[PDB]
């Protein structure tokens, strides 16, 4: 407590399920052995415990639906379809709010139509949400000099030493809030909100308040008249499929991830280890040691994975990936994920491209024009300027059509707040703005209108 | 900190929510201000504190999908569909598993099609799940000398002094339980769980185990031939409609109800505060009273209700509790629960039924068998014979037959585990019996195979 | 046959079904005591055994199709749906083939595609087709001093005096073609042929060998990234209804037309007359006298019917028709179908309008550039300018949007194949150009690409 | 003219079609040169006159349905759905009115209905209508020393010297009944009269006004149920498959079928010559000859075709039949029709489906109960007992059950009146009711409730 504006919530301590079959543990427990980069700093009795009380909760994720996805991603890797995943850089317990979800999901679902309308393919929907809590950091103490924020899987954003401390506790009360999140993901999924009638007001909403309104308007005014054309050909909602929106992460905290482990009913064909935090996870530009136990952990579970590929990667290093964790080779089981900078992609993807083709192996090639165009204003703000982040999925397009490769996807940190975080756009946000709504427990996102704006803009790209 | 096993959360910075339209301040303050059965004993700023986390979680339901159970109890009331609600009588934080809630959700759904094939009409399926954790008791000390269990919501089941004490950081584990209960059971009914071809061998291997499988095997053999012809015709899973599971528990402790109150938006038209802890919800015999805060509380939420009617019942009293929570004449918005024992549902009902219906408002009325017929055994356990129960729900139908009304629907406590708590059926379960695995955390439920067996028997009840 | 290179086909006369009820002929009778322009000459007892042969056949339409029809034709006449309607100007016995039929469909499924999308909304597809056989004259004599041809259900085409006999065996020969034709349109539009994937190619072979192409490019592409947009949603053939194509022809001869006339099953809701050679009928600008036979037999059918009105049409009259022919105020059981003349109609259709709007009726308002634009070629053949044809679908259009009324429809005469009828168009036929293949029996038709490039004038009509 | 009762076609005015490929062209020809069995008598140069007007009319089926039927086909040729064949034995032009047709549409859709209940697998719906206008004949001259009646195709049915001419011109007459009869089979197909729905109506009144009702009450109690299940589970008409009625006859006038053919297009690959005078067609009993023209004609089209099995059929013929008929091994290409008589198919039939079923191939097993069950009454009636046509079914049955084979369907002569050709049933028809109404042209029909009753028989047969 009362004097804290602080509760304490009990872990419950409760009995164990029977434990994960022994040769699957020895093969983890063999992966596990191998260092690994950017872990928290709790004690190992600690760890356990809290690993303990996880390993028998009810699943944020099911076998099926990650069987489906791998599907669905099969076909992004064969060029048939295309990959949007975005969210929050870092999800915070305190905007995991209905409003903070429900805008992210729409901001998504806002994206995905414009885009399968330039790509005329399907769009997979993959959300950053409900439990991309942790992050690696680039230095260990702060520019407040405090022990660096980590997510909220690990500490607390607050700047005070206490707040900072590494506490294993917040492992349950990630899994709290990301089976919350889920469960709202699902019903969002299936309500009203899903629903392609529900665009007509949103794209005009924005061409209306949206300054370069005037440059988006015919394409928005284009899929306003294929939306009421497939509706004038009989097509209804129930004729449509439910909207799939598929949760990820970076599979960073091991601690988390092994604890979210399950074995599937071998109702399929053949029962082995599904990471059940999430729809499919990805290992970090900062844990991607090839030799390390992110990957190792990768090659061991089911689900498909993601590598990011910074400008430091080479084709060489690009097919290793490849041969450890697409050993089987099954299309879209593995993303290689592009974030060079757009002043490098030009010069660096292809080779990569052109030596991971000649394996035989078909990856999906994601882009992620964000993390490699970070810059810090003069007022201070970590920030991404738009035109660079539009520029190298330009340049990522270019690569890949001179190829003949498909250009799979997209991998973006956006919100569906008005906050001003990176610069540029058709608001024109300047380095003064940023103060005004700063809100990102870590990287700049885009915006609600830079996220819609960079989807009329990838969506011409996917036109010629 | 993982050091006392507890969940550190702030409040602090929380805020701040807008402010509900002021007749809807004015009527839930009101409702409040009313006396209050069956209330944990807690402090009031404990409480407080509790709520104002849980004022911002993420709903475990959605305004849409309620709109939607309305729908659908509507055709129930007007005698065009069935209702079947079933589950645990005491969810645990223990049992809030996978298996156990796969198996929950699996015995219902393998009763809903026996139903429907007995009825020959659309079967409605609530659970008693995420959140079914508050039970009012008859008395304040139980036979240990113990302050009674409430459920786990309240306190814990252990039979020691300190369990006991009612802790109102159980609101928050509950609500942590609930979601990711209901995160599992979305996942559940649209994955291959949910598919009507599933029944066949679900049916046969009850079938074939159950002592008494020949008495059922006409009837699991003919639905195995109407799901056949179903096929034969031309109509695969992708031509149906995705299962739909719904949440419902007894609104009993009203700090967890009132903190999970969200408004909705201008959708029908007036903006209505949603109970958004579940679809439905109902009121217990013990907190029924007419001008209580229960009863109060019901009249300003939009979700269906139920309320239980148990031997007492007058019709003129059924009638008030129509009129003041049906009082827009809708139909489905209120479902009568019928819990009179066997030796006393055929005298008892009909003239509670005949007011009611003379009124032209349309409740639905659904036989709660269970909680009418309970006794104690010789060995010391609360337990309930299989023939009364079957006979209260025969008697339930001789009723409405004579009035030429709509024998709504059960509300029944089961699980899909091979427990011994109800004497009798099939398997002759013996006071001998009981002591294997008495397993439930308050009232006797049925079977795996009990429950079963009791939706062949119902099923010829429809037929009839 | 031998020495005529003629076949002889007797008529098998055959036992008559029961006659239709005593009441409905009596009002039948009544109506037909009415005078009748421009039938044939043919004696009163070989008419009676011919209808009586036709009276026993199987119809060329049933009743229920008839009924859904007025359900898509109310829809137009609310300003829901956009009605098609078009073929030749006069079916020939001899050019009732697969590939002319095939043509003739297929035309009117690429013209509707590209109406729907224009329009935004649904467009009803009804085809001068399968009885479209019987033409009025303005002359009994023509320039070869030979009794004027009056379509194949009355005489030949042929030039020769006993070609041109009235002869009512062809009425039974009219019976037969159309039959065999409505099957052959039947087995279409549940074929390859009605999907919308073969558009793709129809559309692009229009835009690649087409003159004015690069004009027609645009609205293609959008057409066409439309269609990959609802494919990518996951909208395939078998989600949509099955393509519907309607026929109709003129109600000209009233043997033909009465011995057609059958007994609704009363299934629906009370039997009544339906004229079963076609599902709707028309009746053209030389037979719609006020106190005619033709007039007062659309009034006696339960089709749909339509009404030619020519430039001497006045407000008052088209009102006498909308109270004769639309007595029960039913949306779309009356059309009004314009054919003025491109200078004409900007001036004598808004006083129509506003007159029959302000009856409380709701017609459909259908456009016929065609009729009203026909003159001669210096080279002697009946001929139409393309631009007049547009332009007066343009003033129709004009006239509508100035009063806030539903441009409801095109009738059109047009074919599949590369004939030169009607002059200008893309292909700049020319009037030396006629020569080549004038293939109408009577009026000259848009031909393939012609129809095309109307249907795409049509759709930016639509658009603003 | 019609002062002669006839119809005056011109054939001069008439050419020209393409030719065939150079190989179709001979192989036709070398089909056509061989030995014809049951041929009409008609002078050459008129039958190639009517031939010559048969060769651009529309045709009856088109090449995509009979592609469709093929592959509807093979499931059932893979034990995977049943073939229900039924309908006159010899359609005249006299009785081919709606009533007659409807009801015959009716009886198969009734029967079939019954017989997927029973088979708990699709049923393909063949009728013998739309052409089946020809008959084979035992003797040259009937028992009044009149040439035989060979069906309406070849002469007239009344007993005259002059009727009993065989006359060219109906093969033309046959043409115009054929497509005006499947014009009103498609028209009924996509009504309200294909409609599972009204099912319950028609086995109710039958159940009720049937001698032995009771007999078939349970069952028809189950399909009700089974349908209102179907129902209960979301799933309504809009929902399901369209109707397919296919259309059948004996392919036995080779002037008629040759006129009939059709070349497709490069849908499949090589061009083919299709038979559109129906979907599929047979080969009788008295002109499978096996170097003969008919099996010769059947060898050059793509049609799926079926031949007919008696009593003196060896092992080594029906696998020479498989072999020149099947050449290519695709299943559902040919369907052997075994009508042995009930006394004869258990000892014929066995030898017969070992040999055929160790080639590899995967014929259609069909049974034709009627034909090797037929005598002659005291009352000098042509008849069938029906107790010798449910056991032939049931003899058919065992051989199948004991093989391991699939029964794969039966070929009735049914038709929807209440005639009294066949004996017994549960009306007990006499041989003196045989008198009352003796309709059919050749052999004796099962009436509306015989076709129902045997199709119960045979769903039991299907359980059992
Ligand atoms: O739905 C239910 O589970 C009961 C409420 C729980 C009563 C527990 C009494 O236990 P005990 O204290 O008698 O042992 O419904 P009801 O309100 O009675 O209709
Ligand atoms: O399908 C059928 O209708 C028969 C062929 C007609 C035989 C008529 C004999 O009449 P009759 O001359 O003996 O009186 O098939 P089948 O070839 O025999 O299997
Ligand atoms: O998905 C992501 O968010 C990561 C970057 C997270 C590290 C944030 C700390 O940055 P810093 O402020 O400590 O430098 O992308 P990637 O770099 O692994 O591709
Ligand atoms: O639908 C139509 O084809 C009619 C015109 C048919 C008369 C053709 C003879 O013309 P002519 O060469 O004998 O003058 O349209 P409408 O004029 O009734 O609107
Ligand atoms: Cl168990
Ligand atoms: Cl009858
Ligand atoms: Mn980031
Ligand atoms: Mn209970
Ligand atoms: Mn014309
Ligand atoms: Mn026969």
Same mark, same amino acid.
């Given at each position: 407590?009362?004097?804290?504006?602080?509760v304490?919530?009990?872990?419950?301590?409760?009995?164990?399920?029977?434990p994960l079959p022994?040769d699957?543990?020895?093969?983890?427990?063999?992966?596990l052995?191998?260092?690994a980069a950017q872990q928290p700093?709790?004690?190992?009795d600690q760890?356990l415990?809290m690993?303990?009380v996880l390993?028998?909760?009810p699943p944020?994720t099911?076998?099926? /639906? +990650?069987?489906?996805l791998?599907?669905?991603?099969?076909?992004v890797?064969?060029?048939?379809?295309?990959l949007?995943?975005?969210?929050?850089?870092? /999800?915070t317990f305190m905007d995991?709010?209905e409003?903070?979800?429900?805008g992210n999901v729409?901001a998504?679902?806002?994206?995905?139509?414009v885009?399968?309308?330039?790509?005329s393919?399907?769009?997979?929907k993959?959300?950053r949400?409900a439990?991309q809590?942790?992050k690696?950091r680039?230095?260990?103490?702060?520019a407040?000099g405090?022990?660096?924020?980590r997510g909220?899987? +690990?500490?607390?954003? =607050?700047?005070?030493?206490?707040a900072?401390?590494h506490?294993?506790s917040?492992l349950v009360?990630?899994?709290?809030? =990301?089976?919350? =999140?889920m469960?709202?993901?699902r019903?969002?999924?299936?309500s009203?909100?899903?629903?392609?009638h529900?665009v007509?007001?949103?794209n005009?909403?924005?061409?209306?308040?949206?300054?370069?309104? =005037?440059?988006? /308007?015919?394409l928005a005014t284009?899929?306003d008249?294929?939306?009421?054309?497939?509706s004038?050909?009989?097509?209804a909602?129930?004729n449509?499929?439910?909207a799939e929106i598929?949760?990820?992460?970076?599979?960073?905290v091991?601690?988390?991830?092994?604890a979210?482990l399950?074995?599937?009913d071998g109702?399929?064909?053949?029962?082995?280890?599904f990471?059940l935090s999430?729809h499919t996870?990805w290992?970090?530009?900062?844990?991607?040691?090839?030799?390390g136990?992110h990957?190792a952990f990768?090659?061991?579970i089911?689900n498909?994975v993601?590598?990011?590929?910074?400008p430091?990667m080479?084709?060489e290093?690009?097919?290793?990936?490849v041969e450890?964790l697409?050993?089987?080779?099954k299309?879209?089981?593995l993303?290689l994920?592009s974030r060079m900078?757009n002043?490098?992609?030009?010069?660096?993807?292809p080779?990569?491209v052109?030596?991971?083709?000649?394996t035989?192996?078909?990856?999906?090639w994601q882009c992620?024009?964000?993390?490699?165009?970070?810059?810090?204003?003069?007022?201070g703000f970590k920030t991404?300027h738009?035109?660079?982040?539009v520029?190298?999925?330009?340049?990522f397009? /270019?690569?890949?059509?001179?190829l003949?490769?498909?250009?799979?996807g997209?991998?973006?940190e956006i919100?569906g707040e008005?906050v001003?975080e990176?610069?540029?756009g058709?608001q024109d946000?300047?380095?003064?703005?940023?103060a005004?709504?700063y809100?990102?427990?870590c990287?700049?996102?885009?915006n609600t209108?830079?996220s819609?704006?960079?989807a009329?803009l990838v969506?011409e790209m996917?036109?010629?």
């Amino acid at each position: 407590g009362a004097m804290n504006w602080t509760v304490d919530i009990p872990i419950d301590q409760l009995p164990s399920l029977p434990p994960l079959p022994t040769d699957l543990r020895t093969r983890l427990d063999a992966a596990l052995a191998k260092p690994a980069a950017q872990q928290p700093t709790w004690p190992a009795d600690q760890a356990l415990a809290m690993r303990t009380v996880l390993e028998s909760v009810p699943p944020v994720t099911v076998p099926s /639906e +990650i069987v489906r996805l791998q599907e669905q991603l099969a076909q992004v890797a064969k060029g048939e379809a295309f990959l949007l995943q975005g969210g929050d850089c870092a /999800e915070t317990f305190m905007d995991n709010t209905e409003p903070h979800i429900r805008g992210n999901v729409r901001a998504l679902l806002q994206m995905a139509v414009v885009l399968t309308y330039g790509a005329s393919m399907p769009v997979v929907k993959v959300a950053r949400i409900a439990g991309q809590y942790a992050k690696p950091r680039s230095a260990d103490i702060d520019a407040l000099g405090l022990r660096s924020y980590r997510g909220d899987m +690990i500490n607390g954003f =607050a700047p005070d030493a206490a707040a900072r401390e590494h506490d294993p506790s917040r492992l349950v009360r990630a899994y709290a809030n =990301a089976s919350a =999140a889920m469960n709202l993901v699902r019903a969002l999924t299936s309500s009203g909100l899903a629903s392609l009638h529900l665009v007509h007001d949103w794209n005009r909403e924005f061409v209306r308040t949206s300054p370069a309104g =005037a440059r988006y /308007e015919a394409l928005a005014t284009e899929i306003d008249r294929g939306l009421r054309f497939m509706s004038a050909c009989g097509v209804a909602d129930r004729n449509l499929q439910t909207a799939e929106i598929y949760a990820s992460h970076e599979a960073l905290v091991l601690d988390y991830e092994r604890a979210m482990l399950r074995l599937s009913d071998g109702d399929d064909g053949e029962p082995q280890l599904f990471d059940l935090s999430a729809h499919t996870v990805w290992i970090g530009e900062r844990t991607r040691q090839i030799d390390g136990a992110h990957i190792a952990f990768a090659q061991v579970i089911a689900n498909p994975v993601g590598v990011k590929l910074g400008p430091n990667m080479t084709p060489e290093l690009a097919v290793e990936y490849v041969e450890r964790l697409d050993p089987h080779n099954k299309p879209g089981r593995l993303t290689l994920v592009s974030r060079m900078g757009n002043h490098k992609v030009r010069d660096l993807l292809p080779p990569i491209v052109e030596k991971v083709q000649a394996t035989g192996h078909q990856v999906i090639w994601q882009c992620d024009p964000m993390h490699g165009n970070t810059h810090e204003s003069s007022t201070g703000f970590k920030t991404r300027h738009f035109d660079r982040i539009v520029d190298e999925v330009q340049g990522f397009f /270019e690569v890949h059509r001179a190829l003949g490769t498909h250009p799979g996807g997209i991998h973006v940190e956006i919100t569906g707040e008005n906050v001003t975080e990176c610069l540029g756009g058709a608001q024109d946000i300047s380095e003064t703005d940023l103060a005004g709504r700063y809100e990102t427990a870590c990287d700049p996102r885009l915006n609600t209108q830079q996220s819609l704006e960079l989807a009329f803009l990838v969506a011409e790209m996917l036109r010629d």
